[model samples]
Target: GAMAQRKGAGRVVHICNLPEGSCTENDVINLGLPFGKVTNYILMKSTNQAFLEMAYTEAAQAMVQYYQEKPAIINGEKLLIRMSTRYKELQLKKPGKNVAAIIQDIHSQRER
Candidate 1:
């Protein structure tokens, strides 16, 4: 069947229907913060999709299941959440210059 092997248990989560030009990695990352640690993520503005890697399987599961009951609204647009069977671990490069700068800006604001 087409659905065979579709349901998987892993630390990666796939987010779809993200609002491009409005949503950023920060919004997606912050959404998962309450449930668990978002160690890594990739936001593809071209496709309006993103992948999030949580710290643990339990945390990832909690995030997916929690969002199922409550819609995850980022930048006023609701998102779709599910377990990502693509990768068990997301091994991406370091954040881009803009992303890094964003972090330091937030840090300075918090430090004040």
Candidate 2:
């Protein structure tokens, strides 16, 4: 098993191999929310990858471990989840259409 030894890797998870065009921030949240509070996230549509920051390192570890044992498949595409190399949390102060819209969508859905 490829264990993450980097200090920063504990709190950030890098997700790859997402289904292009169809993959959205909602998918990322669906995969991440079960393990912990998603503090921040970014969807890289061009690369079909994403970075998810959990509120705590423990949650990040659990999320990665769970997915590793049982792979996540979305839209018939498998995903790769690993620890992020970045030591700090994601900084999406000025959110883009992808992240901002999804956050709003989540909030709106919860309101119902």
Clashes found in each candidate (C-alpha, N, C closer than 3 A): 0, 0
- Best-fitting candidate, measured by TM-score? 1
Q: What range of 10 consecutive residues in model 1 has the weakest lDDT sum?
A: 99-108
Clash pairs, candidate 2, are none
Structural similarity to truth (TM-score) of each candidate: 0.70, 0.69
Local lDDT at 82 for model 1: 71
Give the per-residue lDDT digits (tens) of candidate 1, residues 19-41.
77787778887777566556568
Please report, in order, the local distance difference test score of every candidate based on alpha carbons: 0.65, 0.65
RMSD, every candidate, angstroms: 9.7, 8.5
Candidate 2 minimal-lDDT segment of 10 residues: 1-10
- Check candidate 1 and list the clashing pairs: none
Error of 1 at 22 (Å): 0.3
Q: Which stretches of candidate 2 lie over 4 Å from their true place?
A: 1-10, 95-112
